DNA sequence: TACCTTAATAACGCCAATAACACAATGTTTATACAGCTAAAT
């Protein structure tokens, strides 16, 4: 009904479903996805 | 690579009850004696 590209609907559920992928997986002893996206935002303040 | 929200999970605080300490107190136990009894003595 919306006049827009379907690409950026699906582009943003892609990217979230990729990235909840990578922090459920992404080490042998699950870690909570909050802490690990503080843990990043940190190590961004660091790099900087 | 955001947030949070609310909710919820899980920690935690508080509170009963309580078994166990604890002492008490006696009545028992114990030891005691000292004693009239007894063994030996004489």
Redesign the pocket.
């Known amino acids: 009904r919306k006049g827009f590209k379907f690409s950026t609907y699906a582009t943003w559920w892609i990217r979230?479903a990729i990235?909840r992928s990578?922090?459920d997986q992404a080490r042998t002893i699950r870690v909570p996805?909050?802490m690990?996206?503080?843990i990043?935002?940190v190590?961004?303040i660091k790099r900087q």
Do not use: F, G, L, Y
């Open positions: 979230q990235t990578i922090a996805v909050h690990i996206e503080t990043n935002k190590n961004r």
